Symmetry: none
Subunit: 92 residues, 18 copies
C-alpha cells in the first residue's frame, strides 16, 4: 500500500554489488526508441540503491520507471526479480 518509490527501492535493494553496476550501465545507455529517457552518468554513478529509485521515477514517471526496471532485470539475467516484478505490477 506504500508509494511506488518504496516498491522500486526494495527491488534495487535486492541487487548485489556487481548487479547494481550492470543495472546502472543499462540505465545510462537505455535504447532510445522506447519513449524512455536515459539518465546522466554522474548522478547515476554516485547514487545509492534508494537514490537510484528516486532518480528513475523523477526522470520518467511511475509507468515508464516500472517498465524500465522490468526490462533491465530481464537484460541482466536476474529472472527471479524479473518474474516477481511482473507479477507484482500495480494497476496504474
Amino acid at each position: 500500500m506504500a508509494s511506488t518509490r518504496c516498491k522500486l527501492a526494495r527491488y534495487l535493494e535486492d541487487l548485489e554489488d556487481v548487479d547494481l553496476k550492470k543495472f546502472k550501465m543499462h540505465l545510462e545507455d537505455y535504447p532510445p526508441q522506447k519513449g524512455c529517457i536515459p539518465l546522466p552518468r554522474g548522478q547515476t554513478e554516485k547514487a545509492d540503491h534508494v537514490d537510484l529509485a528516486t532518480l528513475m521515477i523523477d526522470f520518467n514517471g511511475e509507468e515508464k520507471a516500472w517498465a524500465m526496471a522490468v526490462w533491465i532485470f530481464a537484460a541482466i539475467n536476474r529472472r527471479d526479480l524479473y518474474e516477481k516484478a511482473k507479477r507484482d505490477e500495480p494497476k496504474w
Copy 2:
C-alpha cells in the same frame, strides 16, 4: 518527562546513515488516506535527525507524528525501535 520533540529526536537519533535515508523517503511519500500530510522534499532532504523530528511535529501534531514514526519504523524493518516506540507511547 521531557517534550515529545525530545522523544522523537532520540529515536531518529538511533537510525543509522542508510535507515535515515529510507525514513525520509517514507515521509515524503506517506500514503495519502490516513489523515496525515506528506513533507516537502527540500526541507526533508536537508534536515538533520533533530531537524527531522521538529518538522514532523510541526506538520502533523504530536498524535499523528507518533503514529507516523511507529508505522515507518515498521515499514523499514527496524523492529527493535518499532516495539520500543509502541511500548513507550505517551498517554495523550
Copy 3:
C-alpha cells in the same frame, strides 16, 4: 547477561567460511509461511558475522530471530550449535 545481539553474534562467529555462505543462503530464501521475513541479497552478501546478527534482529525481532537461527542451524546440519542454541534459549 549480555544482550541477545551478542549471543547471536557468538554462534554466527562459530560458523566456518562455507557454513556462513550456506546460512546466508537460507536467510535470503526463508520459507514464506512462518511469519518470518526474508533478508535482502545485497546487505546479506556483504555482511560480516557481527553485521549478520545485527541485521537478523533488526528485521524480525528477538523471538523470531532466535527461532530462525535455530532452524537454519538444523537445516545446514550443524547439530552441535543447534543443540547448544536450543538449550541456551532465553526466557523471553
Copy 4:
C-alpha cells in the same frame, strides 16, 4: 519445504572434484536450442558449489534450472543423482 536454491545446492554439493569441473563445462556450452541460456566462463569458473546453484537459478529461473541440472547429470553419467532429481522434482 526449503527453497529450490537449497535443493539444487545439495545435489551440487554431492558432485566430487572432477564431476564439478565437467558440470561447469556443460553449463558454459549448453546446447543452444532448448530455450536455456549459457553461463559466462568467468563467474562459473570461480563459483563454489553454493555459488553455482545461486547463478543457475538467477540466469534461467527454477523450472529451466532444474531441467538443466537433470539433463547435465545424465550427460556426465551420474545416474544416481539423475534418478534422485527426477523422482524429487517439485510440482511447480
Copy 5:
C-alpha cells in the same frame, strides 16, 4: 577426559589407507532407516582422518556419530576397533 571429537579422531587415525576408503563409502551410503543422515560425496572424498571425525559429529551429533562409527567398524571387519569402541563408549 577430552572431547568426543578427539576420541573419534583417534580411531579414524587407526584406519589404514584402504580401510579409510571403505569407511568413507559406508558413510556416504548409510542405510536410511536408522535415524542417521548420510554425508555428501564431495566433502567426504576430500576429508582427512581429522576432517572426517569433525564432519560426522557436525552432521549427526555425538550419540549418533558414535553409533555410526561402531556399526561401520563392524561392517568393514575391523573387529579390534569395533570391540575397543564398544568398551570405551562414553556415558552420554
Copy 6:
C-alpha cells in the same frame, strides 16, 4: 541391508590380481547392444576394487550395474562368484 555399493565392492574385492585386470578389460569393451554404457580407459585403469564398484554404479545405475557384474563374472570364468551373485540379487 547395506547399499548395493558395498555388495558390489565385496565381490570385486574377491577378484585376485589377474581377474581384476580381465574384469576391467570387459568393462571397457562392453558389447554395445545391451543398453549398457562402456567405461573410460583412464579412470578404470587407475581404479581400485572399491573405486571400480563406485564407478560402475555411477555410470549405469544399480539394475544395470548388477547385470553387468554378473555377465562379466560369467565371461571370465569365475563361476563361484557368478552363482553367488545370481542367488543374492536384490529385489529391485
Copy 7:
C-alpha cells in the same frame, strides 16, 4: 599525566578492525541495570577510535566510562587490554 580522554583513546586505538566492531556492538546494547546509559547506533557506527572515546566519556563520565571499557574488554576476550586497564586505573 594526560586527561582520561587520551588514556581511553590509546586503548581503543589498540583494538583491530573487527574488535572495534564488537566493542561498538557492546556499547550500543550495554546491559541496562548497571547505572550506565547505552549509546545511539548512528553516532557510534560512524565514530572513529578517538570519536568513540570522546563519546563514551560525554555520555557517562570518567568513572563509569572506565568501568564500561574494562567490562567490554573482558566481554570480547581481549584479556591483554583488560588486565592492562585494571592495573592502570586512575585514583579518581
Copy 8:
C-alpha cells in the same frame, strides 16, 4: 538491440581470471600505429569487467573499441570469442 557498452561488457565478462590480466596488458601497450590510443595503467589495473568496457569506449569510440577488442582476442588466443565478435559486429 542494447547499446555497444553491453555487448562489450558481455564478452569481457566471458574472459576468465588470467585472460583478463592479459587483455588489460594488451590494452595498456596497444601498438601505436593503428589510430588507437593506449589506456592508463592505474585505471585499467583497478577496473572490473564492466569498468573495462566503459573505459575502452570512452577512450576510443565504438568503431575503434570494437576493432581493439577483436584484435586483442586474437592476440591472446581466445579464438572462440574472436570468431563470435567478428560474426556479431554491428553495422555502424
Copy 9:
C-alpha cells in the same frame, strides 16, 4: 529549443566525479593562442556542473564556449560526448 546554457549544462552534467576535475583543470590552463580566455582558479574550483556552464558562457560567449567544451572533451578522452557535441552544434 532551450538556451545554450542548458545544452552545456546537460553535457557537463554527464561528466563523472574525476572527469569534472580534469575538465576544470583544462579550463584553468586553456592554451593561450586560440582567442579564448582562461578562467580563475577560485570560482572554477568551487563551481558545480551548472555553475561551470554559466561561467564558461559568461567569460567567452556562446561560439567560443562551445568550441572550448568540444576541444576539452577531446582532450580528456570522452569521445562519446565529443562526437555528440560536434553533431549537435547549433547553427549560430
Copy 10:
C-alpha cells in the same frame, strides 16, 4: 548433440596415464607448417583431461582442434581412437 568441448573431453578422458603425457608432448611441439599454433608448456603440463580440451579449442578453434586431435592420436599409435574420431567428425 553436445558442444565439441564435450566430444574432445570424452576422447581425452579415454587416454591412460602415459598416453596423456605423450599427447601433451605432441601438442607442445606441434609441427609448425600446418596453420596450427603450439601450446605453452606450463598450462599444458598442469592441465587435466578436461582442462586440456578447453585449452586446445581456445587456442585453435573447433576445426583445427579436431584435426590436431586426430593427427596426434595417429602419432601416438592409439588407432582405436583415431578411427573413432575420423568416423565421428561433425559436419562443420
Copy 11:
C-alpha cells in the same frame, strides 16, 4: 627476552601440517572445567601459525595460554615440544 607472543609463535611454527590441524581441534574443544575458554571455529580454522598464537593469548592471557599449549602438546603426542615448553616456562 622477547614477548611470550614470540615464544608461542616459535613452538606453533614447529608443528607440521597435520599436527597444526590436530592442535586447532584441541583448542576448539578444550575441556570445559579448567578455567580456560575455547576458541571460535571460524577464526581458528582460518588462522596461521602466528595468527594462532596471537589469538590464544588474547583469549586467555599468558599464564593460561602457556598451560593450554603445554597440555595440548602432551595431548597430540609431540613430547619433544612438550618437554621443551615445560623446561622453558617463564617465571610469571
Copy 12:
C-alpha cells in the same frame, strides 16, 4: 623571518587527517597545572589547520603556544615534528 603565526601554521599543516583530530583532543584537555589554558570544544572542532594556529596563539601567547605545540607533538608520537620544532624554536 615571518610571524610565529606562520611557523605554527606550517607544522599544523604537516599533521595528517587523524593526527589533527588527536592534536585537537590534546588541546581541549590540556593538563591543568602548566600555566596553560585549555581551548573550547566548539571552536577547536570546527577550526582548520590555519584557524587552529591562530586560536592557540590568541589563547596563550607565543611562548606558551610554542611549548604547547612541542609537548603535544611529543604526546601523539610525531617525533619528526617534535625534534624539528625544538631545533627551530625562536629566541623570544
Copy 13:
C-alpha cells in the same frame, strides 16, 4: 600543446595504486640540497593524481616540478616513464 599541468597529470595518472604511495613518500622527503621544496604531509596524503600535479607545480614551478618528477620516477624504478619524460621534456 596543452599546459604542463596536463602533461604531469597524465604521467601521474599512469602510476598504479602502490607506485603513487611511493611517489608521494618521495615528494614529502625530497632531499634538501637541490633547490626544491618538500610538500606538506596532509595535502599530499589526501591528494588525487590530478591534485598531486596541481600541487607540485604550485610549490616549485614548471622547471623544478618536471625535474622532481623525472628524478622520482627514476627513484621508484618506473624506468618506462622515466625514459618517456626525459624524451618529452618541453623546451622551457
Copy 14:
C-alpha cells in the same frame, strides 16, 4: 642520498608475506626496556610495507627506528637483511 624513510621502505619491501606478519608482531610487542615505544595493533595490522616504515619513524625517530629494524631482522632470522642493514647504517 634519499631520506631514511626510503631506506627503511626498501628493506621492508624485501620481506615476503609471512616475514612481514612476524615483523609486525615484533613491533607490537617490542621489549619494554630499550627506550623504544611499541606500536598500536590496529594501525600496524592494516599498514602496508610503505605505511609500516612511515609509522616506525614517526613513533621513534630515525636512530631508534633503524636500531629496531636491525634488531627485529635478527629476531626473525632474516640474516641477509640484518647484515645489509648493519653495513649500510647512515652516520647520524
Copy 15:
C-alpha cells in the same frame, strides 16, 4: 608487432612450475656488476607469469630486461628458450 611486454610474457608463460621458481630466484640475486638492478623478494614471490614480465621491464627497461631474460634462461638450462630469445631479439 606487439609491445616487448607481450614477448616477455609469452616466454615466461613457457616456463613450467619449478622453472619459474628458479627464474624468480635468479632475478632476486642477479649478479651485481652488470648494470642491472635486482628485484624485491616480496613482489617477485607473489607475482604471476604476466606480473613478472611487467615488473622486470619496469625495473630495468626493455634492453636490460631482455638481456636479463636471455642470461637467466641460459643459467637455468632452458636452452630451447635461450636460443629462441637470442634469435628473436628486437632491433632496439
Copy 16:
C-alpha cells in the same frame, strides 16, 4: 655427536624389507604395561625408515624410544643390532 633422531634412523635403516614389517607390527601392539604408548596403524604402515624413527621419538621421547627400539630388536631376533644398540646407548 648427532641427535638421537639420526642414531635411531641408522639402525632402522639396517632392517631389511621383512624385518621392518615385523618391527612396525611390534610398535603397533606394544605391550601396554611398560609406560610406553603404541603407535597408530595408518601412520606406521605408510612410514619409511626415517619417518619411523621421527614418529617413535615424537610419541615417546628419547629415553623411552631407545628402550622400545632395543626391546623390539630383541623381540624379532636381530641380536647383532640389539647388542650394538645396548653398547651404544647415550648417557641421558
Copy 17:
C-alpha cells in the same frame, strides 16, 4: 659467478628423493654447539630443493650455510658432493 643461493640450490638439486629427507632431518636436529641455528620442522618439511637453500641462507648466512651443507653431506654419506663442495667453496 652467480649468487651462493644458486650454488646451494644446485647441490640440493643433486640429492635424490630419500637423501633429501635425510638432509632435512639433519637440518632440523643440527647439533647445538656449533654456532648454527636449527630450522623449524614445518617450513623444512614442506620446502622444495630451491625453497630449502633459500631457507638455510636466510637462517644462518652464507658462511654458516655452506659449512652446514658440507657437514651434512658428510653426515649422510654423499661423499661425491661433500668433496665437490669442499673444492668449490667461495673465498668469502
Copy 18:
C-alpha cells in the same frame, strides 16, 4: 616430420627396464670434456622415458642431445639403436 622431442622419446621408449637405468647412469656422469653438461641425479632418477627426452633437450639443445644419445647407446652396447640413430639423424 615431428619434433626431435618425439624422435628421442621413441628411442628411449625402446630401452628395456635395466637399459634405462644404465642410460640414466651415463647421463649423470657424462664425461666432462665434450661441451655437454651432466644432468642432476634427482630429476633423472624420477624421470620416465618421455620425461628423460624432454630433460636432455632442455639441458643441451637438439644437436648435443642427439650426439649424447648416440654415444650413450654405443656405451651401453645397444648397437641396434646406435646404428638406427646414426642413420636417422636429422639435417640440422
